[PDB]
């Protein structure tokens, strides 16, 4: 039952693939090809530059110098070797392109586009030594641009916005900072996706200190926050969590980390999370430290997350003349970039939903991380998690459901997961809770519990008609997508085999009933019951509980 050999492929060599792919890449949004963008680059105010058989003349073709180095080192190196060689050369490049008085940095970001395409290309057996070389080099690159993410809390009465009005060097350094943090992202996640063996060899307290510099710079509590860097930094925190949940004895890396730094991270996570979601002006500026407003100043995808309008893409192309070797970027209006259809706003409502998914998701993850307690282990997790539960319960019911916009589905799946969070709390972590905390908020926890304890009527459905009516009232947008999906985009959405038309009807029944704020899962209500109706703390003795029992019926 053998299967014969199949070696007669005309195999494209991995090195050749890498080469051609870089050689003709065009990025998501612009108009022009990577290497040739490069071919429109001259590094002028540094009249000579040279590191390792890598001469460039004064007015020389940067881009051709690239393709030169590329091809020559081609018949030198293998795949990984070609990576690390580029990485070192481009690193020296970027470093000096950085440290220079009159130098403009046009090339830097585009080379950072390199950085991505490159390092992403094949992270299979790449070694952390090279990774960290690039990595540290860019973190301290960032501290060479640490003059960004700590710009003040607001425009002062004197601070003007009269301007050269350039979006140029703004977008320049924005791409720089972002792309750079985005490096941090990508290479650090190639770390996390490397074999577990090659891990602690990279982690020193230098990671803590350098990333501590940048984090403090980033998730400001005394400046403007900046949603993209907010993203990046916090997922690096997530990277810490990742190495925790992955290293079997993660106690190694934990002991590496410092208590003050866990604090200066989780506290700023609190600062992040007790902000709010208001699609009302997600696209303007309002109360700060409270709104993740991704303004056009920095609104595109980011080197991974295809977030939306990506409205900067072609403006990436508009940066070079795409006809002449050049050093300083081509002009763009700071304002032409960016009432037609707020459906983009609602794409983003789904995304910032994925963000608060991240918020609760990392908090869950650290929850499971600390099976044993710690110093930042303090219970304010119980407080604030339950607090968020309360607020997205009450304001949920009074505002967001019924507004015929599919944000509510994920807006509720959020707290449906926070249910698991709290139920994790009930099972595991009830050997620390402070009387201090329980009686600082006897209020909100009982609110949370009774939110489903009043839901546990379990007395709605009884037919199709009323709930399908609810649906026709609210589920308009959700059905727009339901019918786009059933009519456009699915194998399963044709030829129901007669055992799933009922699945259609009752699943839509359950989803609409679960849409209108009421009758959540039997699992939900009983798991919450195992917490309150169990008397493990004196929340609920009968003498002060039957007033709620009667307030439910009972």
């Amino acid at each position: 039952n053998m299967v014969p050999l199949n070696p007669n492929r005309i195999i494209p060599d991995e090195t050749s693939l890498f080469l051609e792919s870089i050689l003709l890449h065009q990025i998501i949004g612009a108009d022009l090809s990577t290497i040739e963008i490069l071919n429109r680059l001259k590094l002028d105010y540094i009249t000579e530059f040279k590191f390792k058989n890598f001469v460039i003349a004064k007015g020389a073709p940067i881009g051709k110098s690239i393709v030169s180095l590329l091809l020559r080192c081609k018949k030198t190196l293998t795949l990984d070797r070609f990576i690390d060689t580029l990485l070192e050369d481009i690193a020296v490049l970027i470093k000096e392109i950085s440290v220079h008085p009159n130098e403009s940095k046009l090339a830097v970001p585009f080379l950072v586009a390199l950085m991505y395409q490159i390092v992403q290309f094949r992270p299979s057996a790449t070694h952390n030594l090279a990774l960290k070389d690039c990595f540290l080099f860019i973190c301290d690159l960032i501290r060479i641009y640490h003059h960004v993410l700590k710009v003040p809390i607001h425009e002062s009465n004197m601070n003007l916005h009269v301007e050269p009005q350039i979006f140029q060097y703004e977008l320049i350094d924005y791409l720089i900072i972002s792309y750079s943090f985005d490096l941090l992202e990508g290479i650090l996640r190639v770390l996390q996706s490397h074999p577990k063996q090659t891990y602690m060899e990279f982690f020193d307290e230098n990671i803590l200190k350098s990333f501590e510099f940048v984090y403090k710079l980033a998730l400001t509590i005394s400046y403007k926050p900046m949603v993209n860097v907010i993203f990046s930094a916090v997922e690096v925190v997530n990277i810490i969590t990742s190495i925790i949940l992955n290293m079997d004895n993660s106690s190694d890396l934990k002991s590496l980390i410092s208590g003050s730094w866990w604090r200066d991270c989780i506290t700023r996570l609190y600062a992040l999370l007790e902000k709010e979601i208001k699609s009302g002006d997600v696209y303007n500026e309002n109360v700060d430290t409270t709104t993740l407003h991704m303004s056009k100043y920095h609104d595109f995808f980011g080197l991974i997350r295809n977030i939306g309008d990506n409205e900067l893409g072609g403006l990436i192309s508009k940066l070079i003349y795409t006809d002449r070797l050049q050093s300083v970027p081509r002009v763009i209006s700071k304002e032409d970039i960016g009432f037609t259809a707020p459906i983009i706003g609602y794409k983003m409502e789904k995304w910032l939903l994925k963000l608060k998914d991240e918020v609760l998701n990392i908090f869950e993850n650290l929850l499971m991380i600390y099976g044993d307690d710690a110093t930042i282990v303090n219970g304010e997790m119980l407080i604030h998690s339950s607090k968020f539960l309360s607020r997205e319960q009450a304001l949920m019911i009074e505002r967001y459901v019924g507004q015929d916009s599919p944000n509510l589905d994920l807006r509720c799946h959020l707290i449906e997961h926070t249910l698991t969070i709290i139920y994790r709390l009930w099972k595991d972590h009830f050997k620390q809770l402070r009387e201090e905390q329980i009686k600082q908020v006897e209020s909100q926890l009982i609110m949370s519990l009774w939110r489903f304890l009043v839901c546990q009527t379990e007395t709605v459905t009884a037919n199709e008609r009323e709930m399908r009516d609810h649906r026709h009232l609210v589920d308009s947008l959700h059905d727009l997508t339901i019918k786009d999906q059933a009519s456009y985009y699915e194998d399963a959405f044709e030829d129901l085999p007669e055992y799933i038309e009922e699945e259609l009807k009752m699943q839509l029944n359950k989803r609409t009933g679960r849409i209108m704020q009421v009758k959540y899962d039997e699992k939900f209500q009983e798991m919450a019951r195992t917490i309150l109706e169990s008397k493990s703390f004196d929340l609920t003795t009968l003498e002060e509980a039957d007033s709620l029992y009667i307030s439910m019926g009972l």
Binding site: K278, Y489, A492, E526
Partner: protein
């Protein structure tokens, strides 16, 4: 058919056996004790090839598993006391069920979502931190191929296995749990993205190194991994999430066409597949995603040489992409055609009742609304009054759907006619978009009214106010017309009407179905905000007398939360005295309610004290303790207290 009565009694009596009470999970290992044998048997009565040619009865068989395990969540991780769970020893059992569901993709999706179940599957599993073991075996057989020394039937079975594993790692989240390590992160971009992208490189190379209908299904999945993994989150122009995956599938389709086999006749698939694929692609900016990874220059073969009449429509849409003005006016009812000397077929060249849909829809897009949606689903001023008269007719005789088929329309069109202060327009800003602070500081009082200036309300009283439905009918339709009135009055200061509001709120209390409960409360602020008659005067207090006069804690929160929200939302020293009464309601009274009053005090802080403190002191911890985190600051405000009270009271005693 055979054990049909047995299954009927089973499902009926076990649905009866929801729990000892309505409290139904049974979170713990339950202390009957007869579900071990039936646990084994529900899957032990199905492995029989004489009962494996029918969809529905096996679907009921697997829904039996759904019920058994769903309502014994103490089954999966039950500590099979070697070291393991029973989700682990259902892994191999459900693999046979997923071999049946390999073909039935619909059933596979359902099974994945169905199977504390998934939470617990990786709750103590992540605490124990089987996956290391399975990944070792995977790498093993994976590398065992590539060179070609595998079985024939483990070949087949596990080739389907590779495809199904790819489908698993490629599906959306909200089904799978976060239980596994490698799904943790969010923003739609979590960890195994790239460990699975490394797995993708691996599968690409190995299967390039790799029965007609087999290749059919193969390219079906080649589409599928990027075809059924969308985040959508939009209107009719939805979102496909990973471009790398997109172009990778494009190039493997290229390699398949290069081989030129897996061509099977009767066209169950070819046409449909290719059509759907390029349709999806078109408008979407990833033209450049397509450009490289797949031109069909060879098998395009549109010289009458070369199922074979379906890649022609993708060639037609590529000519539409060419686009320069040579194209002309719509004649054959097809697209605005172009100079042909050509034009291949009609919008359904091959029309097995679904290919027609896909193509004709896509090609229709070549043309260079929510409000329109339901209108066409049941295919202005004239529309207004024609609606009025036709609804007179519809409530003439016991309609229940096309009758109520007008309420939401009424509302949203009130929104549009307010806006006119219908062309391309749907859900609207104040009507339907939240903001930072108070929704009800957001609303505008001195806006128009309903009486006749809104013929919407004119028809509203015409057919929905003086009706026997308000008396004793339309359990929920009479509610839907009130969500209409919701948005209506939202856009319109109403008159007092409140006769509906009052008995409506008391209804909302009892409610029977807990749907009406806070619904009235949602209603109230509309009445509360007001102008043009008792804007901010007694009107609210008038409601208040009503409300406070209601005292029952039966459906307590209806009585109480709204009681708050009104006064809450109201303006200054008025609501100040109101919150004085509210902190009275929290003062020392109905521990069920004083506490919750504090809860929603925190709530309003989310979205009086000195006066009361001094008062109660003169008269004679929780509140201040919760407020300031410690009561000792009372020194700060003790000024007007110690001086004016605490001594003159009972000159010698106190």
């Amino acid at each position: 058919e055979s054990h049909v009565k047995y299954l009927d009694e089973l499902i009926l009596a076990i649905k009866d056996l929801n729990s000892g009470v309505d409290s139904k999970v049974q979170i713990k290992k339950v202390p009957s004790l007869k579900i071990l044998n039936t646990l084994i048997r529900n899957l032990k009565d199905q492995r029989r090839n004489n009962i494996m040619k029918n969809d529905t009865i096996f679907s009921k068989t697997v829904s039996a598993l759904a019920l058994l395990l769903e309502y014994n969540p103490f089954l999966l991780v039950m500590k099979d006391s070697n070291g393991n769970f029973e989700i682990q020893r259902l892994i191999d059992d459900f693999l046979n069920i997923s071999v049946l569901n390999y073909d039935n993709y619909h059933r596979i999706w359902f099974m994945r979502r169905k199977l504390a179940c998934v939470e617990f599957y990786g709750k103590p599993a992540k605490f124990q931190l089987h996956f290391e073991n399975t990944m070792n075996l995977y790498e093993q057989a994976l590398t065992e191929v590539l060179l070609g020394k595998t079985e024939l039937l483990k070949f087949y079975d596990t080739l389907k296995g590779l495809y199904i594993l790819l489908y698993w790692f490629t599906s959306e989240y909200s089904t799978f749990g976060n239980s596994i390590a490698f799904l943790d992160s969010s923003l739609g971009f979590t960890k195994f993205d790239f460990n699975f992208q490394r797995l993708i490189r691996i599968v690409l190379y190995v299967f390039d190194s790799c029965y007609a209908e087999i290749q059919l299904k193969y390219i079906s999945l080649v589409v599928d991994y990027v075809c059924n993994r969308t985040i959508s989150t939009a209107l009719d122009a939805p979102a496909l999430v990973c471009c790398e995956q997109l172009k990778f599938v494009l190039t493997t389709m290229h390699h398949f066409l290069d081989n030129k086999y897996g061509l099977l006749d009767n066209d169950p698939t070819m046409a449909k597949g290719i059509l759907r694929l390029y349709s999806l692609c078109i408008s979407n900016d990833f033209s450049k995603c397509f450009v490289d990874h797949f031109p069909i220059d060879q098998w395009a073969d549109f010289s009458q040489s070369e199922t074979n009449k379906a890649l022609s429509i993708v060639y037609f849409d590529l000519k539409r992409r060419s686009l320069p003005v040579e194209a002309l006016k719509y004649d054959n009812k097809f697209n605005i055609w172009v100079y042909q000397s050509p034009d291949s077929s009609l919008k359904n060249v091959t029309s097995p009742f679904d290919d027609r849909y896909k193509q004709l829809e896509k090609l229709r897009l070549l043309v260079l609304l929510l409000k329109y949606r339901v209108n066409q689903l049941s295919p202005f001023k004239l529309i207004l009054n024609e609606a009025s008269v036709s609804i007179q007719t519809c409530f003439k005789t016991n309609n229940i759907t096309r009758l109520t088929s007008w309420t939401v329309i009424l509302g949203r069109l009130a929104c549009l006619e307010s806006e006119k202060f219908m062309d391309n327009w749907y859900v609207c800003h104040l009507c339907d978009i939240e903001k930072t602070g108070n929704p009800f500081v957001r609303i505008n009082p001195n806006r128009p009214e309903a009486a006749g200036k809104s013929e919407i309300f004119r028809i509203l009283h015409s057919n929905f106010l003086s009706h026997p439905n308000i008396d004793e009918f339309s359990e929920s339709l009479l509610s839907g017309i009130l969500f209409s009135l919701h948005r209506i009055f939202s856009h319109f200061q109403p008159p007092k009407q409140i006769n509906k509001s009052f008995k409506l709120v008391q209804k909302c209390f009892m409610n029977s179905n807990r749907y009406l409960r806070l619904l009235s409360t949602r209603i109230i602020p509309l009445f509360n905000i007001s102008d043009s008659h008792n804007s901010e005067d007694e009107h609210t207090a008038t409601l208040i007398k009503f409300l406070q006069s209601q005292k029952l804690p039966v459906v307590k929160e209806n009585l109480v939360i709204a009681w708050t929200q009104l006064t809450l939302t109201t303006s200054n020293d008025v609501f100040d005295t109101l919150l004085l009464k509210l902190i009275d309601i929290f003062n020392s009274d109905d521990y069920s309610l004083r506490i919750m009053m504090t809860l929603q005090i925190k709530n309003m802080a989310k979205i009086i004290l000195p006066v009361l403190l001094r008062q109660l002191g003169k008269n004679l911890q929780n509140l201040i303790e919760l407020l300031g985190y410690s009561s000792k600051t009372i020194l700060d405000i003790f000024q007007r207290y110690i001086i004016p009270y605490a001594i003159i009271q009972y000159k010698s005693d106190v």
